[PDB]
Each structure stands twice: as C-alpha cells, then as structure tokens.
C-alpha cells in the first residue's frame, strides 16, 4: 500500500526517462550510418604470436607505452611480455592460485592482482632490489573480486562479489568511498578516460554511474535480459558498451542514457565475454563463446571482420592506447597480436 | 641486435625453463572439489583426512592431494563453477538426520543442487563421490515427516538404502558420472580410502582412452 505506489512512481520515472531516450535520439545510431563508408574487409594478420604460457589465460592488460602488456591466468603467473621481440621480462608468483582480475598502472610502477578470495594485492615493479614483492594487500572485503582499476597511483576502484564497489586509498589501506546500490554481484567495470566518473555493471541486468568526489550514484542503465559479462568505456568519455550472455552487445551513452542499437545477429547463439573499442573508434571488438572472435563497427554495427586465431573460449582482449595493435587471448594458453 | 638483446633472450629462456619446471612439479597434485552444504560434517571430514575459499593439502602414500573448500561464498555459482573444470573428483557431503527440520525440507532442496550440477555442460564427465552424515541420529529418531511416499518399514537399513538410492537415482542423462555412494558412519578409520580407490581406478580409466586400448 506504500511500497507498491512508490514502485509505480519509479516505473513512471523510468517511462519519463525512456521518453527522454526516444526524444534525445531523433535518429538512432544505426539510422545515421548510411553516409559513412564501412571499414571494409580488415584482413588482420598475426604479425607476432605470443606463445609460452601453460594453462587457461583469463586476463591481459596494455600499458601506456603501447608496447608492454601483462597476462594473468589460473596457473598462478603474472607475466610481463614485450611487443616486438616477444621475449617476456617479468614473472610474478601469486599467493592465491585462482585469479581473475589484474591491472597495470599507467606509469608502470605498480601492478594490481586479484582473485576470487576477496583479496586484492598490489606489487611494485620498479624496485631497488630489481625484484617484484608485495607492496600492499588491500583486502577489507568479502566475496570475490571481479574488476580492479587504477584511478590514481594511490586511488583504486575495486568491484567485487559483495554487490558493492569500493574506492580505496593504498596509503591508509581503508575504503575511501563505498557503493552499495547494486543488489546482484558485479562483473566488470571500465573507468572514464578523464578518471573522474565510472560505471559499474552487475548481474542484476543493470548498471549504475558513480562519482569519486561524492561517492554516490548518478545514473541508472537497464535493458539487458541477463547478467552483463563485460563492459568497456568509450574513449570520448560520453558513452560505453556492454556485452552479456543475451548475445546482444549494446551501446549506452553516459550523457544520453539511451539504447542506441542491440548489436546482434541471429546466427549468434554465443554469449559475449569481452568488449573493447579503438583509439579512434569505428570498430567494436568482441568475444563470443564460438571460438571465432568478431570485430564489428562502432557505428555501422555490421559484420566487419572475423578472426579465427584461437580454438577455445576467448577469455580476454585489449587494444593498445596508441590504437596500433590488438591482442586477444583464450583458454588454449595462447596470446595473439593482430595488425 | 647487441648484448642487451642476447641478455634478454637468455633471461627469457631461463624464465621459460623455470616455468616448465614449476609446471612439471605442479602437475603431480590431484584435484578434489568439496561441496559441503551447511552442517554437512565439514569439520568432521577435515578432521578425518588429517573469508574466501580455503585451500588444504595432505599426503596419502606416494600421492599428494589438494582440495579447495568453498564456504560462505553466497555468490552465483555459474560465474565460478567453471573455474574447477580441471578438477578430478567432486565430493558431496549430505546429512541424513535432518529430515525433521524445515526452514521445504532441506533433503528435498539438497537434491536440486545434485541434479543441477550433474546435468551441467562443464561437468559432462567428472567423477562424483557422495558422502553421508548423521546416520546414528537418523536411525535413533526414525519417515512420514520427509518421505511419506515411500511408506515402507521404519528399520534403519531399509530406510537408509532407500534414501541413498533416491540420491543416486536422479543422475539425469549423465550416467558416465558414476556416483560413488559411501556408507560414511562419521567414525570410520580412513574414509579417504573411499576416495583413493575411486580416483586411482578412474586414473587408470583416464589412462585407457589415452592408452588407446579403451
């Protein structure tokens, strides 16, 4: 008698914001892509092939130099690879054997690693002794980590299975801000390029914006029929893309909150594992259960390129900040760079 | 193309050699996944073999054993169930004298976990060993509370053999996952023997298809 009317008020506010989506987009993205010529058949060839691991790899991250990347797997190894010589440099052991999240600092000084044991660990790469040791354990949380990101050298956003994202300071080892709006456990996030706002997507089939300075929510995103597996942010800082088990990649604008187009083709029964863009856009990289990776267009959202390098579930994918090369990796213990 | 490149090549070769040595050393361990549910005798079983998940290791004869206990995870199973795809054995622990407690009896709800985990796609063929618990209090108190459809004798052996049969009956279409039901009294000397034979025979079977004879 009091919560039902409040939920109806919520539904009316959602309908108002949907009318706002249906008026802000006088013509959606897929309707304004006739003029722009397609990217064409992009026959990406493997210039180098990054082999040498053993077990199922699960994450890879690029550096600011666009030449040093970090690979993390369930075997218990963080390996720092090279771009052109393909000769790895740093091998780091792991206190927890099972790990799914990893991040490389923009300056390259530190590296964050995290498993499902609700423990986030941070190591220092450039040390006086020349080795890599435990700089600090973040911890302070229950459940399982899902995404870690470096907002600053001393500010970090973590998003874990306790249905709560946390902005932490490494110096004090305490949660600077907490975000408990989500009801289901979150899966991944992508920080803004300006490093002032961030979106977080959960298994609630929804996502929400969060501010660092205020520590509260700013905007809701819904429409998915199931849990959002992956989400990446547009480098312009106004939009982002989500991918889920519903086989529908979606592009939601942060400042327009509108459903542009559900990127999906029937022949697709596979679910999305990873999503990324280019430095200049014009292409949406994606990862599906079918082992053939797919690259679509950021605008056209039509079949652009198919990459059949791996014969297993594509686990991680990334683009260099230069936009020069792209690296993908799957459970078959192999990493591949295209160009 | 100078001394720096040769030193980088040497360092990469040394790291590759250390990686291959660590992999060869770590391949010897056996993978067991415990699926203890509430008061399923988790403390009793960890006594018998000796905030996140708990990793335990023990030695039996010449073979090591590594087990991961997932307790109070309270998360969706589908996100992290596939992380134990490479597990060799799946151990299930279920109490028997809890058929009078309803939070919808827990015995009915415990089949739902077993029926679902068997018919999953990742675990199409994995050895499943189910254990028991609280036999003595089950026979002391005992039928119509939880299983009125059976409507048979109240003696322990006929009642218990019925209950373990319904656990093994609902194997679904994954009959390759043989259910090694065991009469764990919770005071037995070495219940890990029940695991040990049930891994090593399977190890022989895991050789055979590789061996080519079967």
């Amino acid at each position: 008698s009091e919560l039902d009317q409040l939920r109806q008020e919520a539904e009316q506010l959602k309908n108002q914001i949907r009318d706002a989506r249906k008026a802000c987009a006088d013509a959606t993205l897929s309707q304004i892509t006739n003029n722009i010529d397609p990217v064409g058949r992009i026959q990406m060839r493997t210039r180098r092939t990054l082999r040498g691991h053993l077990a199922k790899i699960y994450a890879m991250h690029w550096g600011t130099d666009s030449r040093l990347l970090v690979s993390a797997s369930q075997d218990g190894k963080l390996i720092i690879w090279d771009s052109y010589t393909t000769n790895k440099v740093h091998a780091i052991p792991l206190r927890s054997s099972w790990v799914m999240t990893c991040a490389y600092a923009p300056s390259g000084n530190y590296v964050a690693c995290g498993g499902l044991d609700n423990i986030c660990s941070i190591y220092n790469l450039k040390t006086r002794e020349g080795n890599v040791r435990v700089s600090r354990e973040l911890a302070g949380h229950t459940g399982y980590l899902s995404c870690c990101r470096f907002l600053d050298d001393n500010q970090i956003v973590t998003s874990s299975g306790d249905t709560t994202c946390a902005l932490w300071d490494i110096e004090t080892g305490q949660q600077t801000t907490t975000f408990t709006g989500h009801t289901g456990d979150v899966m991944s996030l992508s920080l803004a390029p300006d490093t002032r706002l961030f979106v977080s997507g959960a298994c609630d089939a929804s996502a929400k914006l969060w501010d660092v300075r205020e520590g509260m929510c700013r905007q809701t995103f819904t429409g998915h029929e199931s849990d959002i597996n992956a989400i990446c942010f547009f480098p312009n800082g106004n939009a982002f893309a989500t991918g889920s088990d519903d086989a529908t990649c979606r592009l939601f604008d942060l400042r327009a909150d509108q459903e542009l187009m559900t990127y999906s083709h029937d022949n697709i029964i596979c679910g999305i594992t990873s999503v990324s863009f280019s430095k200049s856009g014009r292409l949406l990289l994606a990862g599906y259960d079918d082992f053939n990776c797919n690259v679509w267009d950021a605008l056209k959202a039509d079949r652009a390129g198919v990459l059949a390098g791996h014969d297993n579930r594509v686990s991680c994918l990334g683009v260099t900040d230069d936009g020069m090369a792209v690296a993908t990796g799957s459970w078959d213990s192999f990493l591949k760079i295209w160009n | 193309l100078s001394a720096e490149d040769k030193a980088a090549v040497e360092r990469s070769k040394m790291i590759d050699r250390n990686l291959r040595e660590d992999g060869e050393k770590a391949a010897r361990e056996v993978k067991l996944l415990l699926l203890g549910a509430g008061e399923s005798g988790k403390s009793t079983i960890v006594k018998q073999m000796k905030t996140g998940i708990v990793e335990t290791h023990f030695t039996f004869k010449d073979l090591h054993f590594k087990m991961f206990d997932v307790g109070a995870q309270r998360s969706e199973r589908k996100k992290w169930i596939h992380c134990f795809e490479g597990v060799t054995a799946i151990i299930f622990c279920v109490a028997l004298s809890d058929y009078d407690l309803v939070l919808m009896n827990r015995m009915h709800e415990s089949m739902k976990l077993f029926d679902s985990i068997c018919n999953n796609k990742w675990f199409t063929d994995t050895s499943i060993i189910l254990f028991l618990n609280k036999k003595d209090l089950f026979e002391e108190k005992i039928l119509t509370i939880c299983y009125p459809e059976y409507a048979g004798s109240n003696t322990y052996e006929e009642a218990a053999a019925y209950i373990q049969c319904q656990f093994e009956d609902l194997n679904k279409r994954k009959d390759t996952k043989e259910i090694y039901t065991h009469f764990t009294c919770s005071t037995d000397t070495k219940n890990v023997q029940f695991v040990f034979d049930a891994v090593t025979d399977v190890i022989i079977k895991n050789n055979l298809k590789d061996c080519g004879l079967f």
Epitope: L68, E129, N131 | S2, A3, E4, A7, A8, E10, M14
Partner: single-chain antibody, 232 residues
C-alpha cells in the same frame, strides 16, 4: 641498501696468480649480471670482465681474453674472479658493477669500492679535453665524440655517463642520452648528434667535482672514454 664490497687486493708479483671476490647482500644474486671494470691509479678507467645472470655467456677484453676467469656461487650469493699472469696494463682499481639487462632497464646501477691493486682493433672514443676549468653557478657542456655513431637499427643511442666523487665510488647521471637515473637532480642533460655527444651540467657547487666518462654499449667491447677531470 645493498653492499657490493670487494675481497681486496695487494701488491701481487708480476705474472702471478690471485683470487678476488665481490661480497653480495640485500639483492638477488641469481638474477643479476656482474661486471668488473678497470680504473687506472693515476688516470684511466677501462673494462676487465663480465658474467651473465645464468653463466651462459662470458666476455673479456684483449689481454683478459685469456689469463682471467670468473665464477659465481648462488647459495652463498657470492662472486669469484681468478686472475693469472698479471701485467702492468692489467692492474688497476678494479670496480665491481652490478647490472640487469631488460626492457627499460637502467644498467650499471650500482658500483662497488675497488681495490688498490698495483703490481710491483676496437672502437675508440675521445673527449674534448680532460682538464676543463669551471665555475660554480655557471652552465658547462662537456663533449665526447665517437668514430662510429652509436645509433643502432632500433634507434636507441647507447650511452651512459658517470660522476666520480673525490675518493668515492661513481654514480650514474644519465642513461641512453635522454633519460636520467635515481637520486640525481634535473640539472644533468644529454644532447648532440649520433656521432658527437655532449653532456650539459649546470648549477655547479661543491657536490659535483670529479671525473666524467662517456660510455659505449653498442657492441661487445664496452670501451670507456678517456675521461674529463672537472677542475675548479
């Protein structure tokens, strides 16, 4: 920090034999390379020896190609150097150098103390003059020219510099002609072409006096420069 002290030398007989050791502590000996570097007692600084991290490749100088060997021991975390048939050109102030070679690494990071070891072609570079008078507070530039340009195919200029404090170990100032090192102020800079190099120093005071040397890491010989003693 780390300790890279030496076993110590004496007045070895000419053409004799001796052992030397560089004591190690507070770092990973098993993952670091090790160098031994000449320094003439009167004036000079040259190369002696080399050992890689995994003992795979070992290089030497002209006279050091024979008559000298090096070995490591990782359980004790220690180094040994067997010297045979010492000559007058061989004996020097043997400085112990640690280095690790990888992407973005800064080689020649730490230097030892040396020994008072006095008994009884290849690419040659040269500085302008070894006695350049300077004044505090005034910017000076000292140039070391090389016959063969150090610009490798990858585009990296292989060069290093060093400042030798009075009666103390040297410290690195700039690596690869463009990037600095740890524990140094911004006042040191590198410039020049691939054939002629220069180091610019400024804001001179009583904490920068000594000798400076131009490096060469392009090929197998690590042939040091003649050197410049910055006088006052």
């Amino acid at each position: 920090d780390v300790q890279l002290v030496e076993s110590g030398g004496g007045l070895v007989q000419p053409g004799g034999s001796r052992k030397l050791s560089c004591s190690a502590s507070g770092f990973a000996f098993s993952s670091f390379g090790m160098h031994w570097v000449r320094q003439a007692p009167e004036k000079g600084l040259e190369w002696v020896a080399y050992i890689s991290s995994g003992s795979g490749t070992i290089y030497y100088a002209d006279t050091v190609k024979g008559r000298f060997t090096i070995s490591r021991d990782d359980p004790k975390n220690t180094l040994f150097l067997q010297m045979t048939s010492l000559r007058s050109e061989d004996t020097a102030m043997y400085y112990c150098v640690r280095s690790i070679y990888y992407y973005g690494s800064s080689p020649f990071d730490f230097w030892g103390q040396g020994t008072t070891l006095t008994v009884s072609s290849d690419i040659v570079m040269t500085q302008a003059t070894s006695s350049v008078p300077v004044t505090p507070g005034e910017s000076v530039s000292i140039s070391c020219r090389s016959s063969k340009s150090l610009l490798h195919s990858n585009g990296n200029t292989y060069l290093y510099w060093f400042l030798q404090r009075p009666g103390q170990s040297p410290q690195l100032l700039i690596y690869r002609m463009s990037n600095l090192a740890s524990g140094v102020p911004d006042r040191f800079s590198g410039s020049g072409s691939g054939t002629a190099f220069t180091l610019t120093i400024s804001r001179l005071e009583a904490e920068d006096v000594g000798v400076y040397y131009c490096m060469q890491h392009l090929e197998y010989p690590l042939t040091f420069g003649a050197g410049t003693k910055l006088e006052l």
